[PDB]
Design a protein around this ligand. Structure first.
Ligand SMILES: Cc1ncc(COP(=O)(O)O)c(/C=C/C(=N)C(=O)O)c1O
Ligand SMILES: Cc1ncc(COP(=O)(O)O)c(/C=C/C(=N)C(=O)O)c1O
Ligand code: NA
Ligand code: NA
Lengths: 393, 251, 393, 251
């Protein structure tokens, strides 16, 4: 029994040990209550505006689309306090934790952005906070590791499995199974057991809401398509949500192709995986014939995840949203291109979305199209990685 | 069928049950088989066997290591079922229960999984990450193949859950670390077994006095395995000791 | 002969070789013209809003002032594209360069923020750009060095003298003395020869303008005092400008005290220096009895400068603005305090301003006062330095 | 006074002037004094001496190194004036000009600086970072102490500047690397001297033919100094050669 539907078609659900169901039901009830509370909404809006810096700009590229009939705008989540879209929903989830009476915070992170967001929110709102992060990501995203610690957050390196997002997730769940009474598990993406996919979307939907208002004001019409990278699915669903009922607007999600889909070293379960049950949900998974979870790969830590949010799997199944993939090299080229032509250093995660927009433009340069790419975060955290690579070349 | 006969026989003897747990293929196919035979020799009334899963997000480091070992041995679900057939062929009456993760059951079709269980001789299946709320397809397939669906009764359980577990479960009720036995019996729940934290004979005794049909010892057995890793011949006797030194606490 | 007054009382002027006077007069005329051109203002406003992200938030601290009668707001220039206030005026100066017909850009930098700002602006507006940076700063502010290069800017390490801001400045001037025909020297602070002090102030004054509008909207009254760190003086004059005629509002500038004024290792020429002539202006300088320029010191690269803008020297002389100093340790404590209590990681430069606000509060906890601190930039660039220090302790 | 007598004598001989430039205290107090004596021996009509400044934002690497050397020798403005007094005591008629940076002149009072110059025997002062626009206090103090204020006529100069330089300057007009000599003479500007890039005898000849009273050779001399650094006894003869091999190009 639940207040909201835990499924998106066949995908979603609450596949967790019985011991965690009370925590999920309590969270769902708190969320429903909060969504109806004007006082909660006002506090959330206040934090987003005066602390996080919303609304974020919608920037028109004026150099990268030269010589084509593509008009490209970038939704600037890179300008949000923290440097990424992650901040939006952590503020909401943090307020929920307080609404419930929790004083501690558990979180997992890949690119370290959700970790930093969880830490900054906890510091501001008086909550304790411990973050799980794959040892591999602890290294390739070191800048966020420092930031997290400076704000009083406990950073816990995870050496299990592939030492990445997936492994950090497993630990966060194991931890919450024993500390769910005083701690709220602040999941960082639109995945996991219900109600997280729903809560994360609702707390990230202002991205699409502002984008719609800004594009209408600037172009007098909706975009032909909005494009976002998809790791777990939060920034993409945040961008998509308000446009779902606008059938003319294409919704394009970009999964990481890593070294190439054919190499098996990627993170594109939605299009190249198989439905399974893991991390509390029924959703597309990268898995062996035996049903073991496969380890994923991406140059981008934030996209290195073997699964994907249930609503994306659903939107894909019904044909409302289309999903594609972009390889490490294509994302790297987009990264360099944005730096040199627009003076904006994007996160490597966001670079996958940009890379696909560039492909849409370059492939059919005479096609008139108005596109919006969700620039989910800034690339300061990837500066050392991109350099260490462009150096080998 | 086997759980029913067991409790029926254990009731005519005024005693409870002692169910040990171990991971299949750990630390190897051969050693694992020898481990289980030892467990039954000592006094294991029933068995709870875990199938190695890549991401056991519901097991402590103890069990995590075991899986790693199995995988290090190239152990797979398929080889686990090969083992179960061998165990069943040697021990025809002992109840055998499996501890599974949802994806390993859902992978090649839920119905097909339970069919394989019936085929090999498995008696029950507890899916760790499937709460009663999502159990429908699982328990239905289990029942169709004469497999008992095992449900966990958490410490933070409520009346609503008690009634569901009571009517959905079979074989036995897995209890997480007195009145909680009253309701189950009132609702006619599968013989309740206390688990988690059960690592001493007295804990087993108090469980029977509380009204439980017996007690399951989780990592209590696994903790012994790893501590005698480099010494196979020691591990076995170490296990024989504990098991016998536990089943006696149920008579 | 000039269109605008080159002096602020006794301070300012145009003390450059005769060969550079035409460049300064041309720049002054272009600026005056641009300030009257609604088309220029609209383009500048467009870039500030849709590319840089203005207006920036005015955040109320709700934890650091607990138990006192101080209400503190932080003007969030750390949320501006680039991570610091430097971006504001580079966009304006870049538009001026184009208005004049220049295609190249020369710039100097300390904390690397002005360098990154110059590089991003040049990438966006189609200008060439080379940056001079002290070898010492190249190391302690390495993150900005990478960013600058990724955007196509040439970073030139300066090993001369103390290998810091002052030395980078000298090189930029020497370079412009020979390449002033095709390149515009985009000075990064409110200092140097006229018209730079005036141009930089006017292109940074939106900081104070927005702060006034936001504080009036939030508190219904002007601040008792606005506080900003002072290296060359751009962020402080940007904050101050719109409040100069509001006599009730105190204007407080914070110079770096380094290891302590008495150690001689600091960067506080305004209060502990002597008027001199250097870098094209007559202004307070840290100098020997002989008149040689002294090398300055600060844990903060952006404040490591032996001089200060002429308008600050003037505002101080007439008593309109007050200047104080904050040591390395006080700034470090403010840095840690903001991270842990408000979840905001400030630049070490900005931390000097915050440190003084904290002192105003802690010294007289029962004094009712409404304060605004200009958070000139984010501290991601100082993450490795602060860690390497807090480690020794 | 000395520049006037010089050009007057150089006019009765149908010749121009050759003014070399060097940094005082470089590479040392002793070696510097010996360098200047050599310069005058070869044929230096006048001298342009630079005082080491901490931040010479208007000099190339060549001169930057020289300052560093002087500072490495503990050279200071005070010791420079001690040197100037010694040079003046040995050579009573040769015009001596100083190349200064504004702060070194402004430091202990502008009037006091020019007073020291008059006291020691200096004839002119060119302040590198003081354009005619900001020259008032400087040229006024210079004139009060019988010191000639030298102004630079840049290549990008205009008519307005020509008239100011012509009326404000004394001693001579510093020209940066034909018609530009016409105006100056029309406005009655101090004898014009061409500088910057003047490193060959022909350049000096063409300068006189252009209408200049002579030519100043900037780093042309300094470039020679550094190239014979490790060899003091070589540097001197190296310099003697060039100077003589330049003043001849003015006769
Ligand atoms: C900048 C950014 N963009 C996109 C992604 C993708 O996550 P989504 O849910 O799909 O939106 C992350 C994600 C980062 C982490 N995994 C983490 O920081 O935690 C980013 O940090
Ligand atoms: C964040 C920040 N704050 C303050 C200062 C001070 O310069 P002001 O002019 O006084 O405002 C700098 C300055 C940095 C550099 N020197 C440079 O990046 O260039 C900063 O980068
Ligand atoms: Na994914
Ligand atoms: Na300064």
């Amino acid at each position: 029994t639940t207040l909201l539907n835990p499924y998106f078609g066949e995908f979603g659900g609450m596949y967790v040990p019985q011991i965690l169901m009370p925590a999920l039901n309590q969270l769902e009830e708190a969320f429903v209550s909060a969504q109806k509370d004007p006082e909660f909404q006002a506090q959330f809006a206040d934090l987003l505006k005066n602390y996080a810096g919303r609304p974020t700009a919608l920037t028109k590229c004026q150099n990268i689309t030269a010589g084509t009939r593509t008009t490209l705008y970038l939704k600037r989540e890179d300008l949000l306090h923290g440097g990424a879209h992650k901040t939006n929903q952590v503020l909401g989830q943090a307020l929920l934790a307080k609404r419930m009476g929790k004083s501690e915070i558990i979180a997992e992170t890949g690119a370290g952005n959700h970790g930093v967001a969880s830490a900054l929110a906890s510091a501001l709102l008086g909550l304790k906070c411990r973050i799980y992060m794959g040892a591999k990501d602890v290294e390739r995203q070191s800048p966020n590791v420092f930031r997290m610690r400076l704000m009083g957050a406990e950073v816990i390196p995870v050496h299990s499995g592939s030492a990445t997002l997936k492994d950090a997730c497993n630990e966060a769940l194991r931890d919450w199974s024993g500390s769910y009474e005083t701690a709220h598990y602040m999941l960082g993406t639109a995945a996991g057991p219900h109600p997280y996919p729903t809560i994360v979307r609702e707390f990230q939907r202002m991205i699409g809401e502002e984008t719609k208002a800004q594009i209408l004001d600037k172009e007098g019409r909706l975009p032909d398509a909005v494009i976002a990278c998809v790791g777990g699915g939060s920034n993409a669903i945040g961008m998509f949500a308000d446009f779902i009922n606008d059938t003319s607007v294409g919704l394009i999600g970009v999964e990481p192709g890593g070294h190439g889909i054919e190499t098996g070293e990627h993170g594109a379960p939605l299009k190249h995986g198989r439905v399974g049950i893991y991390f509390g949900m029924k959703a597309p998974m990268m898995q062996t014939a035996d049903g073991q979870i496969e380890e994923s790969y991406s140059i981008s830590a934030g996209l290195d995840f073997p699964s994907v949010g249930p609503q994306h799997a659903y939107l894909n199944s019904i044909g409302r949203a289309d999903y594609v993939s972009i390889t490490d090299d294509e994302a790297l080229e987009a990264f360099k291109t944005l730096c040199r032509h627009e003076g904006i250093i994007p996160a490597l995660e966001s670079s996958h979305a940009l890379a696909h927009a560039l492909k849409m433009m370059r492939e059919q340069p005479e096609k008139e199209q108005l596109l919006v790419v969700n620039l989910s975060g800034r690339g300061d955290k990837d500066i050392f990685t991109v350099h260490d690579i462009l150096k080998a070349r | 069928e086997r759980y029913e006969n067991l409790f029926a026989q254990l009731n005519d003897r005024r005693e409870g049950a002692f169910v040990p747990f171990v991971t299949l293929g750990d630390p190897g196919i051969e050693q694992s088989l020898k481990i289980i035979d030892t467990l039954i020799d000592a006094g294991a009334d029933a068995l709870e066997l875990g199938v190695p899963f890549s991401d056991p997000l519901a097991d402590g480091p103890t069990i995590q290591n075991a899986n790693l070992r199995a995988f290090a041995a190239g152990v797979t679900p398929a080889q686990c079922f090969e083992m179960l057939a061998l165990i069943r062929e040697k021990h025809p009456t002992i109840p055998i229960g499996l501890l599974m993760y949802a994806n390993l059951v859902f992978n090649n079709g839920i119905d097909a999984f339970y069919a394989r269980c019936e085929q090999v001789g498995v008696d029950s299946v507890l899916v760790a990450d499937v709460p009663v709320e999502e159990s429908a397809p699982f328990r239905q397939a289990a029942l169709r193949h004469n497999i008992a669906p095992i449900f966990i009764c958490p410490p933070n359980a409520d009346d609503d859950l008690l009634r569901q577990v009571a009517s959905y479960g079979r074989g036995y009720t897995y209890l997480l670390s007195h009145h909680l036995i009253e309701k189950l019996k009132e609702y006619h729940a599968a013989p309740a077994l206390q688990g988690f934290g059960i690592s001493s004979p007295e804990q087993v005794s108090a469980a029977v006095r509380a009204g439980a049909a017996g007690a399951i010892s989780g990592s209590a057995i696994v903790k012994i395995i790893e501590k005698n890793l480099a010494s196979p011949k020691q591990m076995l006797a170490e296990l024989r000791s504990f098991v016998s030194a536990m089943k006696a606490a149920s008579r």
